[PDB]
Amino acid sequence: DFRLQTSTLCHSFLLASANKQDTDYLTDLLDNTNIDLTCVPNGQEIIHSLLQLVGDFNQRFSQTHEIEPVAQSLGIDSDKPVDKTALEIFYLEILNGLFEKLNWGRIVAMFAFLRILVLRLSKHGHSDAIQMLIKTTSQYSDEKLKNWINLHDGWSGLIEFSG
């Protein structure tokens, strides 16, 4: 099932791209979250590609953009319990904006950004917002990307996309 597969990739990818402290906080959140995971084919190859490619993304985005603005505008840097559903809305609008066209590079950008949000949310332990972002990324993927993705060998497209 594609939605379940894509969900599992987000979790792994986030666990493999965080520092020590965040890795542990996220790993336990997921454990306690007690949610379903399948096995993704080529999963390891796909996660490696994503690390390389989100690396490409990060290195460029620190050149030409800053973070602080948007977290605030999202209401994510607060010690203040975050607005679950307001955040879905904006997230959804950002994805819709990101995805006016489809290709691998734009998909990469969705993982690199989701990472950035998740890591900022976790500074103050915003566990439910975090799980919310990951779930929304999963639905949206299943609603709008899956056909494009399956035309390109599925999630494994990333492996070749990246060389």
């Binding site: 993304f57 950002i94 734009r106 996309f161």
Partner: peptide, 24 residues
């Protein structure tokens, strides 16, 4: 819209990545 804008800033970086990785 406001957040839509964000998505396209993200989109340009995406398209740069996409271009570079084309087998060209």
């Amino acid at each position: 819209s406001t957040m839509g804008q964000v998505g396209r800033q993200l989109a340009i970086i995406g398209d740069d990545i996409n271009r570079r990785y084309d087998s060209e």
